[PDB]
Amino acid sequence: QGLERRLLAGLQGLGLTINQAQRAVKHFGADALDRLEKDLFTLTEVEGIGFLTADKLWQARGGALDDPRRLTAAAVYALQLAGTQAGHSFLPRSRAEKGVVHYTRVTPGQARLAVETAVELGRLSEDDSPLFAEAAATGEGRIYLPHVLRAEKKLASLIRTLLATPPADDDWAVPKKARKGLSEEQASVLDQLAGHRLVVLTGGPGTGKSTTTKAVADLAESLGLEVGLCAPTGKAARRLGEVTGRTASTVHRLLGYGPQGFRHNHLEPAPYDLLIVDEVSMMGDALMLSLLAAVPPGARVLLVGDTDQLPPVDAGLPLLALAQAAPTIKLTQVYRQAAKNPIIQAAHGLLHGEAPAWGDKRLNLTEIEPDGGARRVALMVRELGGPGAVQVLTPMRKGPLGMDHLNYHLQALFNPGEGGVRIAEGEARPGDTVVQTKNIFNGTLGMVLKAEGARLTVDNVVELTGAELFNLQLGYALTVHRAQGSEWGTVLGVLHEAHMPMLSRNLVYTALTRARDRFFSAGSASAWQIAAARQREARNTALLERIRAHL
């Protein structure tokens, strides 16, 4: 599988690292060197080596800025960037063209040609088929990365078959027994699964998705069914298991992921009569496709999530599409006890577009500016009683009110110190509360006990290797995204106009829902009014349409 000497030498001769040379060859085969001699921008499609790398080498050797191969590849990059920076599955043709202008600063005619060339070469796909509603009316087709279009169609297809075929080997029945503990709405989930292969369960914080899910697990297994429980993250999986009293795992591990791909698929389905997936709000199309591809013929799937939480980082909104297309139980009654909680109340206000009624011993905001703000947040945390007592959250990593700068100040306030060992950003010193960023697993807090030159020991108990140093950062403050699935008694949420592009309803909702007992904000009240008012950035996705053209 290794590279022939002169192949490698030549590839490095174009400015590629060894790793890049390996990726190129995996992608192209032996004539990789010939392909990149003919078209260096052919690198745009190789995972790990993008357009940006192709462009740096290209300009480095005085290659023409308006060379059609660059422009063609810029068309592809526009779509790649659409998915990357905003989760789109496609762009209307005029936006794809605009994408190219924006980046390459060529004329519209040059950009139109670049999109046209990409399509006729099959580096991009064009679809203008009406479906249910779109492309013929607005007179503009959708441009996709080819695999994304194939993937969106396949997903809708699996979903369609799942909706349209009843569960079978069937002897699923719902004894009055199994309904105990559950309300009318919750119990219904058990009924719904008697007749249907695909069922969605949604609802917010105080609605009882956990008991409801456990009850599904219980009933199924009493019927002899083999039940697979999973979630998109390690932490989420760990929690599912905890509340279910069972072994729950990552969607990747459940589907037998490895370097060789997903082990489970249509050829070797996941051996489970029922799949329970929690936190589906975090799932993009690609992973949903992988999961559903692995569902045995006739087998069941329960998808559970909260549609008001942050959308997936990856492209698509499949839980949102499915919530509109599948049998879905939307749980709404809040537990009378938890009906009182000022935070639960402020969270529900967000859903009607209102910012929270600040001015309470358990829910209040302190107005601050970005200048010195971080230092101030540290003093606030001290007022609330130290970082053991409060978790700091923020929309962004970067900038004055962001995670890196907030950790820096927190450390300085509570753990002043000279010489630590360097990690993701900054350095770890004994007494530091750090966060594991990679899968034991990602998201988990801890406590540093000691360091050395380039060696680090923290607590569970283990050391820290030079490559592992990259997979660790200070934990006193986290991004709202990183805090997904986790909960604390008291959280200090930083939110301000300085976080402008992140100010949406879903972001503030997730943040608010991280707090069990108390939630204090630092920033501006106006920043909350914006977030409450503003829906999350729109995503281009034709999945719902496809499921419904099908039906």
Next chain:
DNA sequence: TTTTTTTT
């Protein structure tokens, strides 16, 4: 303009 789930 921003966030960043996954493995043997």
